[PDB]
Write a protein that binds this ligand. Sequence first.
Ligand code: CL
Ligand code: CL
Ligand code: CL
Length: 129
Amino acid sequence: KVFGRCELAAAMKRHGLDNYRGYSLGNWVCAAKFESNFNTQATNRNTDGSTDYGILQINSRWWCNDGRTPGSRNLCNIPCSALLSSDITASVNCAKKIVSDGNGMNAWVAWRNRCKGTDVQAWIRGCRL
Ligand SMILES: [Cl-]
Ligand SMILES: [Cl-]
Ligand SMILES: [Cl-]
């Protein structure tokens, strides 16, 4: 599924991400736009052989199992394919574990480079939330 901006904002709000660990909703929307262009089916392979999955580009070295990333952990306890669902529940629940790990949203490279320090409230402007 390819979300619209407000539709995704609403779904993230319903699943408890607004101000989760102090990150306002626009941060989460901005990270999804630049990680996946709001496409739940997005995959991208990394140099190390790990792959990133879904709307928040969660990495199989640490967080999920894809059966092809040797020595990797599965800290969210889920197959990586779960992260590609039209239902964002599994992505959200894993993202909450990631953002709790010590480095906050700096775990997401696109957030650090494209969202951090910007007017992220713009990403939710206009939406009925
Ligand atoms: Cl915001
Ligand atoms: Cl893994
Ligand atoms: Cl933080």
